[PDB]
Structures are given as structure tokens and as C-alpha cells.
Amino acid sequence: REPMLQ
Amino acid sequence: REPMLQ
Amino acid sequence: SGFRKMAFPSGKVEGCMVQVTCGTTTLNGLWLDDVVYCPRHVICTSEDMLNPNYEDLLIRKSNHNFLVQAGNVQLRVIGHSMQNCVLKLKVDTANPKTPKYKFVRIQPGQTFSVLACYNGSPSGVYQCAMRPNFTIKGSFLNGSAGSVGFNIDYDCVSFCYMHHMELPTGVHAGTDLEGNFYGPFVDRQTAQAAGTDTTITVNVLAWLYAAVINGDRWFLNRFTTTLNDFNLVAMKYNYEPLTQDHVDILGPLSAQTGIAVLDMCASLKELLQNGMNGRTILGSALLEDEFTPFDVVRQCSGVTF
Amino acid sequence: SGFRKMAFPSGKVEGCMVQVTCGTTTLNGLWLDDVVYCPRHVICTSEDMLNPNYEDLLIRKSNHNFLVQAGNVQLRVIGHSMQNCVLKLKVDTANPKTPKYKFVRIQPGQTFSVLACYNGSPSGVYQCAMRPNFTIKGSFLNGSAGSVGFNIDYDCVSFCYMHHMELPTGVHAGTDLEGNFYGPFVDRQTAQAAGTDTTITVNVLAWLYAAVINGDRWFLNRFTTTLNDFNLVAMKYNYEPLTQDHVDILGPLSAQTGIAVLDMCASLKELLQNGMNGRTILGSALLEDEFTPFDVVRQCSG
């Protein structure tokens, strides 16, 4: 998956 | 051990 | 993503905590409107804790015998009465920090947050469940009595527990906010023991649903089961039998995931009979039973207070 | 008695949480005195998340592009700057409920309380440890960025974490309050992965001591070990080397229980080489490593 900025 | 009122 | 044992924010309850000193002993009270709720054994000395006659210890005390401090301010007690196992100390000042609140008596298998307090100062917050045997697996030291357990619904604090004692096995017992003990215990240092406990099946099932929501699903299988056939397995492993209300309560999670409750019971059956074989679920090697279905939905949807 | 994952009371931090919106993206800010600290990726659109140049994005912003809401009140932003990966929005009113506080950068192995928040409002609190690989194992959804981690001593809140992002394996990453990330991570959605992790040996030992204080003793044994013999086994199981500073920090718990640190190491050695045989310690079938020695002393009796 991609990293996710939350 | 006896019950302890805290 | 992720799934943690999460407590409610404690801010609204912190402002209700006060210290009650009745001579030499000190414990915590809960200040709502113009009443301070505290365990009655604040009036005892250590020589009285065995078999106190609370009615006779009370009459020796008058209003001025109760020292109530809310931080840097002292609250004048202008009245005192006993309701079951709590005292109600009327004060001359209604707590300006009183939240919207309810007093509720909870059922075994339901959870709540505890704000552990000492000398009227909060010290910690953690999540508990009322065990089927009516004890709670808390963390409490001498002086913690009067700490409270609660849930929040929107902006309303539902107080369900006030702490009173520790049992010989290291578990804990207390009352609702009307002073009635959970379970058959008494605020006495006589011989007492918690009865047999069981695992809260419907909570284990909710937690397995939480696992699936979060992508932890190795325990899913192509099998199914009837409720009665599952409950035979449940009792074999000292799990609470599943009643169809439990099944109903799991309805929202089953609909969210598309996994029939009885199919998830089939996964739980295989877990009980074959263990986890060194695998983990949501980071745990044991089957966690202190998340309710409401807890799961609350966390996984980001509800705020 | 008893032993639980215990967070600090969250009230003082609840009173500092605000919502920050720049365009269509919203997250949380921390409002202390007249400054609001928040993650810089609040200036990004959903397309600026892959490889943002934050300098470019920020210079294109004005003060009025930042909407700050404290409860149902709008705070006026009157100045902004970027410090590493956080923004500092100066507002026109100081938070009147600002607690005594400090900013600290914690060490892998230390713990803190997280107040998970959405739209400037709190959802819940839980304990986290900073893993050796600079991740934390939290419970964070979109919108949670800007939630903070902290420790409370007396009534001084030591802020040590601000949440930014979720890595692919589902662990979480963020910065200190000065905007420097914990770990080699960057606030972009380019490919990244957490490094290999290890178990925090000193914390497992502290947790064993907690069990002894709470009357669990089945794992104790008559054996002893040297620090070097123990560390040879430790490495074999992905455990951090135990140092003399770690032995020293376990002093109080050793004294209270009367079990030498190296005797507890022998206990842990036998647990690692033989497992637990379906038994449990403090309600856990795994060796817990997210309690510090300080967490044990704070919770347990003396």
C-alpha cells in the first residue's frame, strides 16, 4: 500500500 | 488474604 | 486503521472529583450539583473496617466532621445522609463544572472507563468491563475508593460505578451511584470470594469483527454452525452462552462486514478448539473480551465527545 | 493491585485541541498560549499528498487561508511559519486554559498517552510506546493528524508526539512538537516502510517485576546469568541488548521485590527459550514490552 497522511 | 476497603 | 483498548476522554469527570477526609481516613468523592457522593467507609478507622456498624459510626459524625476539598477550595458540608453503601454530603455550592449526566446500573459484559483518583486528584484513566461474576479487573491502590467508572453519550456522562474494595484474588468490587453493590459483595473486610467467572462471548465476537474490519482475517473459514451447537462448545470452554439478543447486538457489525454472526461463531469455535497456533489477532495471542459491539463501532468510526 | 494500560487524565490536553482547516482538508491543532501547532500537510489538497513541495505550497498561502475553530469560536490567524514538518499559526487570543507545559523528544522505549481527536474534538485516550523502529501502534483514522501524545508530571504536560500519518503495515508515524519526525519517515505518500523492529528488553523486565508485585511468581527460577550471557540469548530472539543503564533503572523494582535484575534476566531467558506453556502473566499470553519501569512504579504499590 501507500503511506497515508491523516 | 482479607478483602481490603480502599 | 488500528484497534486499541480506548478509554473515554476524562476531562468532564476530572472536574467532579473531590477529596473527602473524615478524621484520619481520606478517599475520593464525586461532586455533582450540590451533592458529594463518596463510599461510606470514609467514616471508619482501621480498627472498624472488619465488621463496622455504619449506622452507629454515622451518628457520631456531624456535618463539620467531613472535610471536602476540591483542589484549592474547601466545600462546606451542610448535611449528610447514607444511601446503601454511599454517603451523600450536601454542600453549600453547586459544582460549576457539573456536566450533563445520568446514573445508570450496567449489566455484566458492558464496559466503561475508570478515572483512578487519589486524594481527590485524578491519576489515570483505563478501560474496564463488568465481569460476569460482577467484579472488575481494575488497577486500584489504597485510597482509590470513590473513583468512578463512566460512559459518555454525545455530551452526557453516564456514571455506572464507584470503587469500594479489592477482593483477595486482586479483582475489585464496587457499587452503582445509588450505593448498591455489583455482585454479592459487602463493604466489609470479612471473608469474601468472587464466584466463577466466564469469558464474554459476545465481546469476543465483536473484537473478531473489529479484526476483520482492520484486515486481520486469517481466522475466517468456510464453515457455519447453529447457535445451540456453538453454545455446547462455548460452555466447554467456560464461555458465556450466546443468546439471540447477543446475536441481534452483533447485527450492525455483521452487516458492515457481510459475515453472518453464525459464520463468525464458526470461526470462534475453531479458535477455541485449535488455538491460534502462535498467530495473533489485533496484536493479541488471547481472545479479547472487553470490547463491546458498541465499543467497536465507536472506535472504528471516530465518534467524538 | 491490578495492572492496566493506564493513560494520564486528558482534561488539560482536551482544553488545547482545536480544528484547523485550509481549503477542504481538516485536521487537529494544539492551541498553547497564542500559537496553534499543527501538521504542515493541512495545506495540501488530496492531490498534493504524493510529493508536495511544502515551501511552494506555503508561500502560496496567506493568514486568512487558515481557519482555526476552538469549540464554536473562530480564532483569527495573524501570522504563520513552518518549523520542519509542523506549522505554527499565531492567533489573536492566547488560550486561557493553557496548562504548564514543555516540549520533549522521547527515546525509543518510552511511553505516552495519546488523545485521539477528530475535527478538534476528542474521541478517546490510550497508551502508546515509541517502538525501536520509531513507529507507534495506535488507532488513527483520516482526520486524526494533529492529535498529540504526552506525559503529565505534577500538572506540567510534557508534549512529545504529534500524529501525522499511517504507514502501509498499519503502524503510525509522527514528529516531536518541533516538527522533527521520529524515524526516517517523511510526510509524503511516496513509498516508505518501517524498518525491522525489536522488543524493548528493559520494559519486559519491568513488566515481570509488576507481576511479582501483583503476586505472580511461577516464572521465577533459582538460576542466574551474566549480562553478556543474557544478551547473547536476547539477540537470538530479537530483543534489545540490556545495558548497565537499564540494570540501574530497574534498581527500585529490584529492591522492592528482592529479586536481582540478573535473576529476573534468568527468568526471562527461560521464558524465551521455553515459552509460557499456555499460562499467562498479568492477563497476557505474550511478553509485554510497552510498560516502562516508570510506568510500573507509577501504578503499582510500594
Numbering used by the authors:
A (entry chain C), B (entry chain D): -6 to -1
C (entry chain B): 1 to 305
D (entry chain A): 1 to 302
Please share excerpts from the published article on this structure.
The SARS-CoV-2 translates its genome into polyproteins that must be cleaved to release individual proteins essential for replication of the virus. Given that Mpro processes the majority of these sites, any intervention that stops this process, such as an inhibitor, would block viral growth. The crystal structures of inactive SARS-CoV-2 Mpro, with the catalytic Cys145 mutated to Ala, with 9 substrate and 6 product complexes were determined to sub-2.5 Å resolution. As in previous apo and inhibitor-bound crystal structures, Mpro crystallized as a homodimer.
Six additional cocrystal structures of Mpro bound to the product (cleaved N-terminal side of the substrate peptide) were also determined and comparatively analyzed. Our cocrystal structures captured the N-terminal product after the cleavage reaction was complete where no covalent bond exists with the catalytic cysteine. The N-terminal products carboxyl terminus is coordinated by the catalytic dyad. All 6 cleaved substrates bound at the N-terminal side of the active site superimposed very well, defining a “product envelope”. There were no major rearrangements or shifts in the backbone and except minor side chain conformers, the products bound similarly to the noncleaved substrates. Overall, the product envelope recapitulated the consensus volume revealed by the substrate envelope for the N-terminal part of the Mpro active site.
